[PDB]
Amino acid sequence: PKDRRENLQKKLFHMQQLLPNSGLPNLDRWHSLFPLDTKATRNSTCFGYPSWMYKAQNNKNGRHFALRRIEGYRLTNEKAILNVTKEWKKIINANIVTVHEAFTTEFFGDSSLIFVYDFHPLSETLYDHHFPPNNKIPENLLWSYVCQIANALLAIHNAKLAARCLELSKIIWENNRIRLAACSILDVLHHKTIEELQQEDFVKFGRIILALATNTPTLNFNNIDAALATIVPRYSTQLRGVLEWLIKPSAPGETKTVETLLGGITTHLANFANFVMQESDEKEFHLMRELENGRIARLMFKLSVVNERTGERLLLKLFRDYVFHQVDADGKARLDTNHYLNCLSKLDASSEEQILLTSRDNATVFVVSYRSIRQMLDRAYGELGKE
Amino acid sequence: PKDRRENLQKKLFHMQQLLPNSGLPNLDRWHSLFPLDTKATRNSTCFGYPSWMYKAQNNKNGRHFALRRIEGYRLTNEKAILNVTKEWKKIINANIVTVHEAFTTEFFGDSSLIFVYDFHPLSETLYDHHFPPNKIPENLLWSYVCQIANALLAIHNAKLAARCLELSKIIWENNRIRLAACSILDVLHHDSPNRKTIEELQQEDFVKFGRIILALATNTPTLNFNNIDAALATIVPRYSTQLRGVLEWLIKPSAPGETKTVETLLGGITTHLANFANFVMQESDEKEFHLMRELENGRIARLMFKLSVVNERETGERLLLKLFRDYVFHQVDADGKARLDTNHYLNCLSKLDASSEEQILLTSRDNATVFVVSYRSIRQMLDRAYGELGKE
Ligand SMILES: Nc1ncnc2c1ncn2[C@@H]1O[C@H](COP(=O)(O)OP(=O)(O)OP(O)(O)=S)[C@@H](O)[C@H]1O
Numbered sequence: 001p002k003d004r005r006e007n008l009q010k011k012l013f014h015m016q017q018l019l020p021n022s023g024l025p026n027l028d029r030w031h032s033l034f035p036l037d038t039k040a041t042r043n044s045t046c047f048g049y050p051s052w053m054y055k056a057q058n059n060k061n062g063r064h065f066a067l068r069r070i071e072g073y074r075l076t077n078e079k080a081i082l083n084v085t086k087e088w089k090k091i092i093n094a095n096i097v098t099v100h101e102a103f104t105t106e107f108f109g110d111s112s113l114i115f116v117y118d119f120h121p122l123s124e125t126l127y128d129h130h131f132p133p134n135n136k137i138p139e140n141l142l143w144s145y146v147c148q149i150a151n152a153l154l155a156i157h158n159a160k161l162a163a164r165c166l167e168l169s170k171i172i173w174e175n176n177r178i179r180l181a182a183c184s185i186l187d188v189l190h191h192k193t194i195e196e197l198q199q200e201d202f203v204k205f206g207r208i209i210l211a212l213a214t215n216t217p218t219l220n221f222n223n224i225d226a227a228l229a230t231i232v233p234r235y236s237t238q239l240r241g242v243l244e245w246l247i248k249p250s251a252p253g254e255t256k257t258v259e260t261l262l263g264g265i266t267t268h269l270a271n272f273a274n275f276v277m278q279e280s281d282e283k284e285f286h287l288m289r290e291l292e293n294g295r296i297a298r299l300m301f302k303l304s305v306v307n308e309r310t311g312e313r314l315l316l317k318l319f320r321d322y323v324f325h326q327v328d329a330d331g332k333a334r335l336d337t338n339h340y341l342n343c344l345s346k347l348d349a350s351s352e353e354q355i356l357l358t359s360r361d362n363a364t365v366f367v368v369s370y371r372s373i374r375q376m377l378d379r380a381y382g383e384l385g386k387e
Numbered sequence: 388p389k390d391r392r393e394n395l396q397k398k399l400f401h402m403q404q405l406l407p408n409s410g411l412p413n414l415d416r417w418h419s420l421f422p423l424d425t426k427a428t429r430n431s432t433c434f435g436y437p438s439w440m441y442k443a444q445n446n447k448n449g450r451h452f453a454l455r456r457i458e459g460y461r462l463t464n465e466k467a468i469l470n471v472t473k474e475w476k477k478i479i480n481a482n483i484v485t486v487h488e489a490f491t492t493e494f495f496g497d498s499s500l501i502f503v504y505d506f507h508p509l510s511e512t513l514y515d516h517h518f519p520p521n522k523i524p525e526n527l528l529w530s531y532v533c534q535i536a537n538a539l540l541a542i543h544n545a546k547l548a549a550r551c552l553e554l555s556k557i558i559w560e561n562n563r564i565r566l567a568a569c570s571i572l573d574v575l576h577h578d579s580p581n582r583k584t585i586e587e588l589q590q591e592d593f594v595k596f597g598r599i600i601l602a603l604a605t606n607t608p609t610l611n612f613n614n615i616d617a618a619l620a621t622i623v624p625r626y627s628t629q630l631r632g633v634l635e636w637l638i639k640p641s642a643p644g645e646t647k648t649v650e651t652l653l654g655g656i657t658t659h660l661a662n663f664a665n666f667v668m669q670e671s672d673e674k675e676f677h678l679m680r681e682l683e684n685g686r687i688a689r690l691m692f693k694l695s696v697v698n699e700r701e702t703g704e705r706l707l708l709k710l711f712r713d714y715v716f717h718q719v720d721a722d723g724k725a726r727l728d729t730n731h732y733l734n735c736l737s738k739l740d741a742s743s744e745e746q747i748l749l750t751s752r753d754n755a756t757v758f759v760v761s762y763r764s765i766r767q768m769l770d771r772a773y774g775e776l777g778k779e
């Protein structure tokens with residue numbers, strides 16, 4: 001479908017996107033740096049330092065990656081990078097943006113620390129997404145968020161680690177898929193036990209969901225119980241119950257763990273697993289249909305290698321003119337992308353439909369089907385492979 | 388990849404796939420019936436009647452569906468088909484082959500009852516897959532447990548039961564399993580003495596659940612009543628203790644003080660549902676990269692469309708596009724023989740599509756002149772020339 005296709009068109013387009021007038025310094029291992037930031041203002045609330053986001057191409061493999069730059073940071077200990085990235089690089093999770101390495105650079109005309117993450121096109125912060133630069137969220141979507149975050153914490157926690165940074169602005173959204181996008185950063189900048197940090201995780205978890213449910217971006221100390229009571233008419237009591245459990249501190253004799261929360265999740269984990277599957281299935285049928293592009297592109301390779309290098313190949317020449325050199329009555333071009341598309345669709349299927357191939361010298365004209373032409377193309381292409 | 392390319396084409400070929408000499412009769416709304424039974428033998432153990440499987444194309448929408456034929460069933464009551472399919476038609480679940488309708492027909496030269504299901508290409512029965520005509524990994528077994536649990540959850544919350552729960556009636560396709568005989572016994576037992584309650588029937592599901600997994604785990608197709616506890620102690624060394632505990636919980640009838648529900652099983656599974664959920668998600672992501680690649684192919688094809696339109700329509704700035712085409716596809720070796728290289732073709736057009744800043748050398752027909760040019764420059768010459776033809 002169209003929305004799915006235009007989403008994919010927007011993803012591929014974001015990756016190629018550049019800014020011809022931009023002046024950002026090329027790194028030793030990176031080039032084509034592109035800004036990901038959506039506003040012109042930066043605060044040090046999130047990191048303790050100003051932050052910049054960029055899309056860049058790797059010089060060695062050419063793939064695109066995301067770089068989070070921390071402004072005004074000087075390395076005072078090579079252990080702070082090495083003792084953190086050694087643990088976080090290993091963590092691979094569908095709801096955590098994977099980090100690869102961390103290094104300092106001086107190319108920004110200052111001292112910056114640079115983290116590399118997987119680049120996810122069209123990702124926008126969960127904050128900006130539910131609170132635009134200027135109603136209520138379905139409960140199902142809220143449960144989608146809880147399950148995804150639960151999946152992440154289970155894995156982080158299975159590594160004797162903690163998220164530390166768990167906020168609306170550091171979780172990326174892309175078609176209802178959310179990921180933790182600031183991992184391993186506070187781990188480095190700070191050099192306090194992991195368990196208490198793990199407990200704060202549950203707390204930060206709760207405020208994020210609570211914020212979305214009550215439609216309030218900024219969160220205060222005073223309404224952890226007030227805003228908790230605004231959700232009972234709009235949402236189920238089960239929802240309010242989970243939020244209450246994550247956010248409230250005590251857990252007096254047996255402290256909060258992810259494994260205990262899961263039974264709390266229950267059907268939504270099963271339901272959720274069902275949803276991702278319905279989605280993986282829908283992509284499967286959508287994939288098979290696109291396979292034609294590969295079949296069509298591969299046909300164009302063959303036709304172009306053969307053309308213009310005589311014989312049976314004359315028809316193939318006459319065929320290209322038929323597909324692409326069509327003109328209107330005044331001599332004006334009859335550009336029709338659909339025509340290009342439909343000829344090749346028919347060529348790929350070895351369609352039995354017939355066409356008229358007039359030579360430049362009009363004395364001879366060939367009546368032929370797409371099937372025959374298709375068989376002719378592979379033939380000529382195969383004879384070039386013999387030598 | 389080779390496997391990814393080959394698996395998906397095998398799906399599309401199977402949906403369209405034919406057998407001309409079959410002699411099979413078109414129904415009131417269906418045509419082009421293609422047989423799916425892979426074996427030459429039929430027993431009436433599963434349904435009580437011989438069964439036949441077909442793929443058929445719908446007369447109205449042209450889409451393919453699977454039809455399970457029950458040979459020799461005479462309709463004695465319409466309430467049997469309405470009362471059942473109205474509840475099951477409502478259920479949409481990824482581990483359940485969705486059922487649409489049920490009707491009788493006489494086109495087979497007899498009395499047949501027909502169920503229509505969604506058609507899932509390249510599907511094979513869980514039985515034939517693991518027991519064809521060394522250990523099954525534990526990860527895969529939990530995947531089956533999670534999927535079946537997912538199905539039972541949806542079924543049970545609909546005040547229904549699986550009824551049909553066997554290896555031969557579950558289809559496997561790339562580690563994805565689905566129940567493929569649902570709503571049938573609902574019909575075939577719709578009219579019989581001593582009916583069990585949906586509550587009692589729901590309990591049998593759990594028992595059949597355990598036996599299926601147990602069967603895969605003990606790698607014994609045939610399972611007997613005497614080894615429900617015997618075959619159960621062989622898996623603690625091969626498999627984890629959690630797994631044995633769950634099978635025991637599912638299979639044993641007793642439900643000693645309370646009877647078993649899926650909601651209770653779910654909490655028993657715990658991390659394995661997350662593991663599974665995490666896995667399906669990553670696999671769904673990989674399809675996204677393959678998807679984008681194919682969409683990319685569309686962009687490459689659209690570039691060559693433009694390029695083919697311009698070429699042989701020249702000199703000037705279009706002479707370079709002509710020379711670019713020679714550069715990409717008319718490459719020859721030192722001997723003079725053609726140098727076919729799809730990779731060369733591929734990487735050139737990728738660079739053309741990205742408006743790469745990389746430069747390449749374009750030699751003219753006459754070996755005297757060579758153009759130092761970038762893909763970006765080539766790209767801008769290409770789009771500029773293509774736009775100027777729509778202007779006239
Ligand atoms: N792995 C990633 N892949 C792609 N885009 C990403 C990735 N991680 C982050 N982003 C993008 O980078 C941005 C990071 O968020 P920020 O720009 O720091 O939020 P912000 O609030 O606008 O800026 P502040 O206030 O200075 S933290 C998001 O808008 C995402 O779109």
Ligand SMILES: Nc1ncnc2c1ncn2[C@@H]1O[C@H](COP(=O)(O)OP(=O)(O)OP(O)(O)=S)[C@@H](O)[C@H]1O
Nearest residue numbers: 423424425426428429440453506507510511512567
């Ligand atoms: N809903 C379905 N969609 C696609 N293929 C299906 C479906 N249901 C069953 N099949 C295929 O049916 C084939 C065999 O059908 P079955 O009736 O389940 O087994 P069988 O051994 O051929 O027949 P009997 O009578 O049980 S011995 C399997 O290889 C499956 O791929």
